Amino acid sequence: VGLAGPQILPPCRSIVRTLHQHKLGRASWPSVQQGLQQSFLHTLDSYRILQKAAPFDRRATSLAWHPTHPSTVAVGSKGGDIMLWNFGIKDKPTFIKGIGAGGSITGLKFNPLNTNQFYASSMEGTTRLQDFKGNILRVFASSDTINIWFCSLDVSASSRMVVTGDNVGNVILLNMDGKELWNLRMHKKKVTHVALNPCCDWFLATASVDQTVKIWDLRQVRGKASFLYSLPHRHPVNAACFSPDGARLLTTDQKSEIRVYSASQWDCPLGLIPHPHRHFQHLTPIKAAWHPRYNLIVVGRYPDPNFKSCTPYELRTIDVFDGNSGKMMCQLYDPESSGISSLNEFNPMGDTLASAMGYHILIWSQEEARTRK
Amino acid sequence: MSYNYVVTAQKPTAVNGCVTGHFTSAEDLNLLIAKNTRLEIYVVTAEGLRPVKEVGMYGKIAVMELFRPKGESKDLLFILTAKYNACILEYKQSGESIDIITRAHGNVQDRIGRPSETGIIGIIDPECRMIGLRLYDGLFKVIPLDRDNKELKAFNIRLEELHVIDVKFLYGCQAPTICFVYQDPQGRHVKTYEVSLREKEFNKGPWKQENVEAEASMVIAVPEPFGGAIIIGQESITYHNGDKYLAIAPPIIKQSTIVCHNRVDPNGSRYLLGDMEGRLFMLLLEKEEQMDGTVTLKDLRVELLGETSIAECLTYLDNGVVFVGSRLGDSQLVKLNVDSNEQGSYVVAMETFTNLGPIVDMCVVDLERQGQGQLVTCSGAFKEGSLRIIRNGKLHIRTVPLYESPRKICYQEVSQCFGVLSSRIEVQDTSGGTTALRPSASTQALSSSVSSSKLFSSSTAPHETSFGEEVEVHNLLIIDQHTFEVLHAHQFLQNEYALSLVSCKLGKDPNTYFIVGTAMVYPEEAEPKQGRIVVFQYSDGKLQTVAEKEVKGAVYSMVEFNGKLLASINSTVRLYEWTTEKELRTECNHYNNIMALYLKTKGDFILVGDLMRSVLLLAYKPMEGNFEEIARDFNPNWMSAVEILDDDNFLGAENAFNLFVCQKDSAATTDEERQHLQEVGLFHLGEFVNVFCHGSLVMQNLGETSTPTQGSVLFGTVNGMIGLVTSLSESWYNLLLDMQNRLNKVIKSVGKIEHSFWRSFHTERKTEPATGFIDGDLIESFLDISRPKMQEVVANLQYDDGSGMKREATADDLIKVVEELTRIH
């Protein structure tokens, strides 16, 4: 704690010379990545000028980035209403509605193949794959009985698999063309998040309300909790998201905690980042996220008068921590946006951040550049 | 549509590692040397070194250790590559045919893990029970050395200590035992663990943990009769063994960090120590007798032996001779005498071996004859820093010692000289400013001109300097093209570093200037916020300041642009015009960057190499007077260098030792899609590229149409390797790549590593097979195999000889093809 704030300064040592040191071969790459992480933090304290705002109807539930292009993003609502929006285009972005009441989209990834498509998981009970023009291409699975719906979704392209979670305790695993060999139960209650590793292909993670988060091996296990690993918790878990590199698993709870688990001995943790993201009914649950090219963490803060704050000033803001250390390095804040940043996601590109607040979508790029003739 | 060919012009010269032992025969004393892809095997003689073998591996050697299991009549060699291919090899000779047999091979990559900060570490138990590897934090990998472990199967053990500095297996232990130094919030400590194979886990070590110096950085495993371990730090040397503790703090070593070590006596009575200033010390262990016949340590002593090239590694051979393997300077054979010379030195150089590395910059000039290009490189660093002049006819290399670190170079024909940015280290003096460690080019010029510039000396808050801070002093040297004497030296301001340099004409002005971009350096700034562009004119043996331009950032790069100056400052690319009153005026700017390090131009097009936005293709608009972002590579890559192949093709190199080739998306139906550069070529070079440049060394055959490749771009590396990239047609590409496949079916790979795996694109984010690049080295390797193997290689091949129809290819046809290809470098 400390080292940065509304008053305290971000920048540590002025090691930029190291780049040329790297040109000489003396200093190693990870130190350089450390220094440029430092650089990005420094310029991130000038992301403060909120670039753009965007509304739509009732509530935000999920966020996703167009992988190839920076300025494009997809977002999913409380009422099955999807939006696709590009910046610097001004062509009044594209919309698609749904039922509006009980059709809450809850998971959303782009199509790795056809950029004009998208996968989606819906409160209707239909993990679907559908176009931005409205035509549904294919349903993949189904509840076939209302009051039992899906909550979690993710996909991998290198392995060509799809995975999805229910509201009771069972997970389903499909191919990109159907062909289901799964639907064995994994948990006792709702599965809030679930994800696949990108750098391997064949161990999986799932998290649930059961105060437990579980790591599976989708080709080797078939025996209904003949799993690979199981990590316990003190409270439930809202999200468990992998690294891009594959070695650092991040986990984020409902009461007050963040945990970093490592490749090395999944059971024990490396470090605890205490920070409040308290759960609540009408709020959208909070989802920590990695930044694809550093060892940073980005989170939304939701103050708690009962959480033992180390810092005396507790505002509604976006915090930025270091992965492999434990403490903080930056805090984004801007009034006129005193809502609670439920979701936050960086680009795969590295120059942009999106925030999903209640009834609001925010874009945080830098501005105020010099000019040409 | 873009097809490219890469070839080695000069193999790497820097030494990454070196060891001694008995590899070629039980009676021979052998020296093994690693130069980044090459393994060199020599026999030590009374006079020097006899070359016995040189091989290439499909991999960057990170570890090189000899060992002799039970039942073996001579030593085996363990090699581990950067891609974590492990292999155990054996030397085989029969007649004049020499083969290195692969005794064992396997990939020990784990699915997941962050590579550590101090890099791969590899050690082998003295009793040849196991290999130990430090690859990822928190983990220790063990390969049990069973005879059946021909796959080098391994297991992992948790390390509670996540930040290991160094580790070694101990001698004289009934159980395998590691001793290591680690860092934690409480400081640095040294500890040990035994290694239980039965349980595949650590057990408690023989002696308890002890605190060590904050900069404890190397461990030396002392053999019997001493046993125990020595810990080397910045100010102290300690020895630990059981209840035995002995530490010394000799002041002589505090001035420079010790970075490598080697044992002189088999019983461990003497060690060599090498520092960053090239100084070589003798470490002496005094024995103490014990009534039970054991020996304990009585004392430690350090003795200055002298100076060498700055050593990455040292190896005592025999008869007082040491090999000094350097990466920053030439390697050497040196003799140590028992008695000193007139200057008090015990060191005599016997032999020197050329090192071009680090090549930080270079350029091609027809120095001697028109059409005969020669490459002038800024080579080396600190006291080893030099210029190196290279020409063909294999190569002739002239060395110009500078005794300081070069940074950039350009050539100025009209003045018949070169401008060279350089820097030296100075330390605070007794009463004043700072003082140099030795004379060098910036302090031995014929004449000098300190910068009397006062552009922003007024209204500029100075930043204070406390007693103890060392300083870098940058200079621009003007050097004669013929004699390479230091003609003039211009010293820049205190704390300002010069980064980029160009010689050019500007605007309608007929004068030719040297232009330098700089940066103000301060310890607390995450990035520089102040800098200058400075335009000098050379005349009468000196530089006169014609103009300056102050800016708020580091001028990382500059390039000539249609008589205008294009320059990269912090996150901006800025174009300046040269007005009639001889001043710089901002013409235009582009901003969508994090940190623009590299620029190259062709016509009205600009290619920008970014710290983080890997590459950007810009166009200047003469009828609009502004930039447009034409396209961008949306795949992230931490760049180190870039180049323009032609109007449509853009080359890049990045920090994970790969190259890529971008093109415009030909199949784009929208401006948005058109803005996406497509990485059409990918290749794992195995080298860190620092510079590309257009030109050639081979004499150009004016009017030589119907050749395989077109264009020539040379590139230089940290390891001093130089290579050539050229363009290909689709058909030639297909031909040579099929040839590569069949050669791969025929060629014996050292360590049983697949060529495809080695050249496969590889970052921490993604792994993909190679495309669009011909391994020219592999192609040239066709000419060195026997004729039956060639016939096999060309067996069942349809080949288009000259211009015509397809037919069966014969070995001689392919020999002709490859011989023509070899002559491009």
Query: Per DSSP, what are the bridge partners of residue B335?
Result: B321, B348
Which H/E stretch holds residue B745?
helix B730-746
Residues of chain B contacting residue A262, judged by C-beta atoms under 8 Å apart: 138
Q: Which residue matches tokens 């060395």?
A: B399
Residues of chain A contacting residue B612, judged by C-beta atoms under 8 Å apart: 36, 40, 293, 350-351
For chain A, the residue count is 373
Q: How many CB atoms lie within 10 A of CB A182?
A: 18
Give ∠ CA A312-A317-A320 in degrees, rounded to 5: 90
- Strand, coil or helix: B687: coil
Q: How far B762 CA lies from chain A's nearest CA (Å)? A: 12
Measured on CA atoms in the order B735, B736, B739, B740, is the torsion positive or negative?
negative
Q: Cβ distance B412 to B512 under 8 Å?
A: yes
CA distances B361 to A72, A145, B37, B375, B714, Å, are 39, 70, 22, 10, 11
Residues of chain B contacting residue A158, judged by C-beta atoms under 8 Å apart: none
Side-chain half-sphere exposure of B372, counting CA atoms within 13 A: 8
Kindly state whether residue A100 falls inside one of the protein's structural domains.
yes
Contact B110 A244 (CB under 8 A): no
- 3-state SS, one letter per residue, for chain A: CCCCCCCCCCCCCCHHHHHHHHHHCCCCHHHHHHHHHHHHHHHHCCCCCCCEEECCCCCEEEEEECCCCCCEEEEEECCCCEEEEECCCCCCCEEECCCCCCCCEEECCECCCCCCEEEEEECCCCCEEEECCCCEEEECCCCCCCCCCEEEEEEECCCCEEEEEECCCEEEEEECCECCCCCCECCCCCEEEEEECCCCCCCEEEEECCCEEEEECCCCCCCCCCCCEEEECCCCEEEEECCCCCCEEEEEECCCCEEEEECCCCCCEEEECCCCECCCCCCCCCECEECCCCCEEEEECECCCCCCCCCCCCCCCEEEEECCCCCEEEEECCCCCCCCEEEEEECCCCCCEEEEECCEEEECCCCCCCCCC
Residues of chain A contacting residue B360, judged by C-beta atoms under 8 Å apart: 20, 23-24
User: Read out DSSP for B247-315?
Assistant: EE--GGGGGS-EEEEEE-STTSSEEEEEETT-EEEEEEEEEEE-TTS-EEEEEEEEEEEEE-SPPSEEE
Residue of chain B nearest A246, judged by CA positions:
B112
Q: How many CB atoms lie within 10 A of CB A314?
A: 13
Q: Are residues A46 and A190 in the same domain?
A: no
Contact B524 A14 (CB under 8 A): yes
Kindly state whether residue A247 falls inside one of the protein's structural domains.
yes
Q: Cis omega before residue B225 (within 30°)? A: yes
Residues of chain A contacting residue B590, judged by C-beta atoms under 8 Å apart: 372
Count of the separate structural domains present in chain A:
2
User: Which residue, among A96, A83, A79, has the nearest Cα to A54 in the 3D structure?
Assistant: A83
Kindly state whether residue A75 falls inside one of the protein's structural domains.
yes
**Integer Cα distance of B809 and B788 in angstroms:** 14
Contact A264 B327 (CB under 8 A): no
Residue of chain A nearest B136, judged by CA positions:
A264
Q: Are residues A25 and A142 in the same domain?
A: no
Residues of chain B contacting residue A29, judged by C-beta atoms under 8 Å apart: 655-656
Q: Are residues A40 and A178 in the same domain?
A: no
Interacting residues of B394 by C-beta distance below 8 A, sequence separation 6+: none
Residues of chain A contacting residue B357, judged by C-beta atoms under 8 Å apart: 25
Q: Cβ distance A110 to A74 under 8 Å?
A: yes
- In degrees rounded to 5, what are phi and psi of residue A22? -70, -35
Contact A68 B595 (CB under 8 A): no
Q: Are residues A76 and A21 in the same domain?
A: no
Q: How far A265 CA lies from chain B's nearest CA (Å)? A: 7
User: Which residue, among A76, A227, A89, A218, has the nearest Cα to A150 in the 3D structure?
Assistant: A76
**Integer Cα distance of B164 and B184 in angstroms:** 9
Q: Are residues A274 and A326 in the same domain?
A: yes
Kindly state whether residue A5 falls inside one of the protein's structural domains.
no
Q: Cβ distance B576 to B568 under 8 Å?
A: no
Contact B138 A203 (CB under 8 A): no
Contact B117 A40 (CB under 8 A): no
Residues of chain B contacting residue A40, judged by C-beta atoms under 8 Å apart: 594, 612
Contact A19 B690 (CB under 8 A): no
| Mutation site, A8, A12, A16, interface B, largest B CB count within 10 A | A16
Give ∠ CA B3-A25-B559 in degrees, rounded to 5: 60
Q: Are residues A37 and A89 in the same domain?
A: no
Q: Are residues A209 and A277 in the same domain?
A: yes
Contact A68 B676 (CB under 8 A): yes
Q: Cβ distance B43 to B24 under 8 Å?
A: yes
Interacting residues of B623 by C-beta distance below 8 A, sequence separation 6+: none
Q: How many CB atoms lie within 10 A of CB A246?
A: 20
Side-chain half-sphere exposure of B394, counting CA atoms within 13 A: 8
Q: Are residues A20 and A97 in the same domain?
A: no
Query: Experimentally, how was this structure solved?
Result: cryo-EM
Contact A350 B589 (CB under 8 A): no
Contact B718 A245 (CB under 8 A): no
Contact A32 B655 (CB under 8 A): yes
**Integer Cα distance of B203 and A265 in angstroms:** 18
Query: Per DSSP, what are the bridge partners of residue A178?
Result: A175
- In degrees rounded to 5, what are phi and psi of residue B813? -60, -45
Q: Cis omega before residue B358 (within 30°)? A: yes
What strands lie across the sheet with A341-346, from one edge to the other?
A: A52-54, A360-363, A353-357, A341-346
Q: How many CB atoms lie within 10 A of CB A196?
A: 22
Residue of chain B nearest A86, judged by CA positions:
B672
Contact B136 A28 (CB under 8 A): no
CA-atom Rg of chain B in angstroms? 29
| Mutation site, A14, A19, A22, A24, interface B, largest B CB count within 10 A | A24
**Both structure tokens of B750:** 């050292």
Residues of chain B contacting residue A352, judged by C-beta atoms under 8 Å apart: none
Contact A247 B591 (CB under 8 A): no
Contact A30 B115 (CB under 8 A): yes
Per-residue exposure over B711-741, b if at least 16 CB sit within 10 Å of its own CB, e if not: bbbbbbbbbbbbbbbbbbeeebbebbbebbe
**Integer Cα distance of B73 and B391 in angstroms:** 46
Q: Are residues A92 and A28 in the same domain?
A: no
Q: Cβ distance B627 to A372 under 8 Å?
A: yes
Q: How far B511 CA lies from chain A's nearest CA (Å)? A: 26
Interacting residues of B553 by C-beta distance below 8 A, sequence separation 6+: B519, B527, B528, B529, B530, B531, B569, B570, B571, B572
**Integer Cα distance of B35 and A345 in angstroms:** 44
Q: Cβ distance A363 to A353 under 8 Å?
A: yes
Residue B771's Cβ-count burial label (10 Å; 0-12, 13-18, 19+) is middle
* H runs (alpha helix) in B568-626: none
Per-residue exposure over A74-92, b if at least 16 CB sit within 10 Å of its own CB, e if not: bbbbbbbbbbbbbbeeeee
**Integer Cα distance of B233 and B214 in angstroms:** 8
Contact B591 A370 (CB under 8 A): yes
What's at A14, amino acid-wise? S
User: Which residue, among B471, B513, B512, B506, has the nearest Cα to B492 in the 3D structure?
Assistant: B471
What's at B715, amino acid-wise? F
Per-residue exposure over B222-243, b if at least 16 CB sit within 10 Å of its own CB, e if not: bbebbbbbbbbbeebbbbbbee
Q: Cβ distance B82 to B685 under 8 Å?
A: no
Residue of chain A nearest B689, judged by CA positions:
A23
Q: Cβ distance B186 to B194 under 8 Å?
A: no
Per-residue exposure over B376-411, b if at least 16 CB sit within 10 Å of its own CB, e if not: bbbbbbbbbbbbbbbbbeeeeeebbebbbbbbbbbb
CB pairs under 8 A between A and B: 159
Kindly state whether residue A6 falls inside one of the protein's structural domains.
no
Under DSSP, the state recorded for B367 is E
Q: Are residues A104 and A19 in the same domain?
A: no
Query: Per DSSP, what are the bridge partners of residue A76?
Result: A62, A82
Contact A69 B676 (CB under 8 A): yes
Give ∠ CA B487-B490-B495 in degrees, rounded to 5: 150
Interacting residues of B69 by C-beta distance below 8 A, sequence separation 6+: B76, B128, B145, B147
- The shortest CB-CB distance from A370 to any of B589, B613, B625 is to B589
Kindly state whether residue A211 falls inside one of the protein's structural domains.
yes
CATH number, domain of A235, equals: 2.130.10.10
Contact A20 B112 (CB under 8 A): no
Q: Cβ distance B150 to B751 under 8 Å?
A: no
**Both structure tokens of A42:** 């420094």
What is the distance in angstroms between the CA of the first residue and the CA of the last residue of chain B? 24
Q: Are residues A115 and A225 in the same domain?
A: yes
Q: Are residues A90 and A25 in the same domain?
A: no
Residues of chain A contacting residue B159, judged by C-beta atoms under 8 Å apart: 264
Contact A265 B138 (CB under 8 A): yes
CA distances B272 to B284, B305, B317, B352, Å, are 9, 9, 12, 19
Contact B357 A265 (CB under 8 A): no
**Integer Cα distance of B348 and B415 in angstroms:** 40
Contact B588 A200 (CB under 8 A): no
Query: Per DSSP, what are the bridge partners of residue A233?
Result: none
- The shortest CB-CB distance from B139 to any of A10, A13, A264 is to A264
Q: Cβ distance B427 to B434 under 8 Å?
A: yes
For chain B, the residue count is 825
Residue of chain B nearest A372, judged by CA positions:
B588
What's at B324, amino acid-wise? V
Which residues form the domain of A31?
Answer: 13-50
Q: Strands, DSSP E only, in B385-495?
A: 386-392, 395-401, 405-412, 417-428, 434-436, 447-448, 471-480, 486-491
- The alpha carbon of B214 is separated from its chain's Cα centroid by a whole number of angstroms, namely 28
Q: Cβ distance B731 to B709 under 8 Å?
A: no
Interacting residues of A214 by C-beta distance below 8 A, sequence separation 6+: A186, A187, A205, A206, A207, A208, A227, A229, A230, A231
- Strand, coil or helix: B696: coil
Q: How far A42 CA lies from chain B's nearest CA (Å)? A: 7
Q: Which residue matches tokens 């043996």?
A: B541
| Mutation site, A12, A18, A23, A202, interface B, largest B CB count within 10 A | A23
Helices (H) and strands (E) in chain B, counts: 6, 64
**Integer Cα distance of B554 and B538 in angstroms:** 24
Interacting residues of B722 by C-beta distance below 8 A, sequence separation 6+: B8, B9, B10, B356, B359, B375, B390, B714, B715, B716
Kindly state whether residue A4 falls inside one of the protein's structural domains.
no
CA-atom Rg of chain A in angstroms? 21
**Integer Cα distance of B231 and B217 in angstroms:** 7
User: Which residue, among B28, B719, B545, has the nearest Cα to A23 in the 3D structure?
Assistant: B719
**Integer Cα distance of B48 and B59 in angstroms:** 29
What's at B535, amino acid-wise? V
Kindly state whether residue A238 falls inside one of the protein's structural domains.
yes
Q: How far A369 CA lies from chain B's nearest CA (Å)? A: 7
Give ∠ CA B298-B191-B65 in degrees, rounded to 5: 85
**Integer Cα distance of B290 and B242 in angstroms:** 15
**Integer Cα distance of A59 and A52 in angstroms:** 18
- The shortest CB-CB distance from B114 to any of A23, A203, A247 is to A247
Residues of chain A contacting residue B157, judged by C-beta atoms under 8 Å apart: none
- Strand, coil or helix: B120: coil
- 3-state SS, one letter per residue, for B467-484: CCCCEEEEEEEEEECCCC
Measured on CA atoms in the order A220, A225, A230, A235, is the torsion positive or negative?
positive
Contact B588 A25 (CB under 8 A): no
> Nearest 10 degrees: CA dihedral of B299, B303, B309, B315?
-40
Q: Cβ distance B277 to B383 under 8 Å?
A: yes
